[PDB]
Design a protein around this ligand. Structure first.
Ligand SMILES: Cc1cc2c(cc1C)N(CCC=O)c1c([nH]c(=O)[nH]c1=O)N2C[C@H](O)[C@H](O)[C@H](O)COP(=O)(O)OP(=O)(O)OC[C@H]1O[C@@H](n2cnc3c(N)ncnc32)[C@H](O)[C@@H]1O
Ligand SMILES: Cc1cc2c(cc1C)N(CCC=O)c1c([nH]c(=O)[nH]c1=O)N2C[C@H](O)[C@H](O)[C@H](O)COP(=O)(O)OP(=O)(O)OC[C@H]1O[C@@H](n2cnc3c(N)ncnc32)[C@H](O)[C@@H]1O
Lengths: 382, 384
């Protein structure tokens, strides 16, 4: 319990109208940056509009996925591999997912061949795959059996010097996963390894306060935490859970423009802290990308920050970003690995993403949507 | 005793009966002779070899557009049931809006029907969750008393045009209320002389055969020939998750996919023996299921005896090998969603969970590791 942790708990269901003023202020950029980002975003979108579930899986096995990664790695992309599987319901399921993560780390770490955590591939895990009652069991007990398993995987990732990222899932599990992150970052057995990563979801009202906590945790622990900033994949489920809960105040925003403002405000916070964290800006939205690209300034080196995208979704955009003929910024591809069976839940989230009229990836193909609208700055519209 | 005490008690008794206890009667009723099994395998092989030979889910943004796009397949012998996309109304104004959409749709469908009747002409499908703002949460007394006048009014309009009006099936915990509503409507004298009322029953539910017993007996005492759409069920993943959260030791649906297949065939046998008082509507995209029912029904057929059904954008390739004199000479009604993205997502997700699952026929037909031998195998032989 600390002041920084208390700010997280207090924001859980803070009224949406009270959350926004600090985010609007933090997301307000200078005119020069807004004009430059509008220019870059227009160029990216004009390139995109000149362009156009097997498409979402990189390979059935990690051996297959590693082989298919060589082409894009020489173009300037990196990878984070996702062994598909989540929401384990039995001990045997959780055990199989653990062994899949373990064998993937060995294969990825050997494939990395000393490239390190920024140039080389990493892995992403879901805590719900590793505990059989993750969402339906008491938080303290879950962390007690979960911690040995995650620490063991982190130690393997440290052995090979690869990244290991904890994906973010439902809002009611943020606190648990955050407690696990702190324990690992203070664990002396993992010293000297900067590969521990953590996702934060900008559609959550707690997002800026989680980031404050993580930035301070990195500074005091000496671990350069990899922080993947996403908007959030579970919006429809969080709304439906909240409506059943009968609460007037949800843990997430209810207007897409509020999430957009929150993302930019949180990106500003992360870019001001690149000494102690490694920001990873996961988005397919060209306006969001352009804003962050200019927010970050003229100084860049590999390891300062990176972009990220999903396999099968982000390559048309990020082919206009990676490489010396483009923006010369790196992008890490999130790469699902597994069978069609384990793919289903991920596919459903991709459908809610790709099929929503509010999504950038749908609007880019919508004849009713002008380029002028696609490059609108969310602060100026909110 | 209470009215229909025995039949109603049998439904309640099955609600969460152990799965192993549910299956033996279903396996017996779903067992067919070797000769019929041989003929059905031949038909299913033909259908699949035809199939493996050769936005997509919405028929139009408005009912007028959807009706225009229906002419081509109706000329071939298909019929339609239109689904104005919308469900799980959260406000009272949302429910009134959905009501007015159904009302306007019935007028348009009824005009387009132009007197073709409930079997050859188009009909409509409704969801009760669209018509009450707290359908899943509110007490049954309140839900019934506000929903019943709305559904009666829509049924009266359907009667006035002589079109079908089907109540779709949703979550398992809504079955009891929807069935009580069906009974009150079938006994309502204001709807007399119209056989267009329809009702969906989900064969992945343990209650399915006992619900069918109740519906067949209701048809006998009401004088209505009830249209019964037999489906396997669209909410399987959600029911499993809900039952786990609810702390249940036994679920209201089957957990082995072939058990649902056996349940479906057993319930088709029950419906096919009652075509005097119900109109069976066999909704499936599975060519093995279709072939089994086609042969179970025997050689005598006329339009109005029974029909098949399929979803727009999923079933037309299969049923183009079924409709028509040169094929199987059996009709098929296409379920036709009408709307925009503001109501499409929830349908898409149920469709993706259907199309994306390793166990689904529509996925297995495209799976190189699944032989035609396995696709035509009778599931009843696997469990017998
Ligand atoms: C690119 C990426 C995304 C995600 C993950 C990694 C990478 C590299 N990651 C792992 C995969 C898990 O699904 C991850 C994600 N989400 C999450 O909660 N935890 C994780 O660990 N990833 C998905 C990500 O959150 C996001 O959904 C997508 O990238 C799309 O967002 P993007 O910035 O590309 O696109 P926009 O279209 O500008 O935004 C879409 C998002 O907007 C939000 N939304 C939509 N309607 C809203 C309303 N009415 N109110 C509030 N917010 C709304 C949603 O978040 C929507 O996704
Ligand atoms: C064709 C059709 C389908 C449905 C409806 C109308 C028509 C014309 N109808 C309205 C649309 C609603 O979404 C309807 C449906 N479902 C429902 O519960 N209520 C309704 O009012 N419709 C969908 C239908 O139930 C079904 O999902 C599909 O047609 C697919 O079934 P089909 O016979 O095509 O395919 P099969 O692949 O042989 O079987 C798939 C089904 O098997 C069940 N399943 C999946 N996993 C299972 C496990 N582990 N145990 C037990 N059962 C399992 C599911 O029912 C799955 O759909």
């Amino acid at each position: 319990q600390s002041t920084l942790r208390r700010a997280i708990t207090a924001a859980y269901r803070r009224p949406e109208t009270e959350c926004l003023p600090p985010l609007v202020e933090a997301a307000t950029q200078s005119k020069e940056i807004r004009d430059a980002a509008a220019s870059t975003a227009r160029k990216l979108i004009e390139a995109l509009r000149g362009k156009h579930g097997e498409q979402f899986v990189t390979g059935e096995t990690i051996r297959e996925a590693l082989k298919r990664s060589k082409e894009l790695e020489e173009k300037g992309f990196s990878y984070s591999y996702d062994m598909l599987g989540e929401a384990a319901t039995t001990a045997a399921d959780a055990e199989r997912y653990y062994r899949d993560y373990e064998s993937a780390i060995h294969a990825i770490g050997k494939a990395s061949a000393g490239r390190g955590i920024y140039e080389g591939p990493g892995i992403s895990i879901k805590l719900s795959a590793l505990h059989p009652r993750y969402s339906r069991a008491q938080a303290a007990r879950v962390m007690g059996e979960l911690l040995p398993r995650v620490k063991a995987l982190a130690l393997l990732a440290k052995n090979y010097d690869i990244g290991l990222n904890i994906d973010a899932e439902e809002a009611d599990r943020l606190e648990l996963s955050l407690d696990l992150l702190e324990v690992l970052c203070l664990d002396g057995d993992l010293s000297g390894w900067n590969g521990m990563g953590f996702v934060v979801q900008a559609y959550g009202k707690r997002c800026p306060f989680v980031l404050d906590f993580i930035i301070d945790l990195a500074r005091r622990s000496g671990r350069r935490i990899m922080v993947r900033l996403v908007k959030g994949a579970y919006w429809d489920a969080e709304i439906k859970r909240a409506q059943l809960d009968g609460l007037a105040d949800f843990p997430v925003f209810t207007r897409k423009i509020h999430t957009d403002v929150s993302y930019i405000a949180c990106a500003a916070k992360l870019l001001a802290a690149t000494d102690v964290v490694f920001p990873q800006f996961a988005t397919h939205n060209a306006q969001t990308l352009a804003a962050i690209y200019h927010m970050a300034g003229k100084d860049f080196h590999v390891g300062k920050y990176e972009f990220q995208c999903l396999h099968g979704m982000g390559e048309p955009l990020y082919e206009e970003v990676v490489g010396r003929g483009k923006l010369d910024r790196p992008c890490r591809i999130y790469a699902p690995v597994g069978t069609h069976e384990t793919l289903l839940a991920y596919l459903v989230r991709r459908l809610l993403e790709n099929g929503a009229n509010s999504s950038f990836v749908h609007r880019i193909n919508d004849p009713k949507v002008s380029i002028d609208e696609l490059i609108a700055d969310p602060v100026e519209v909110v």
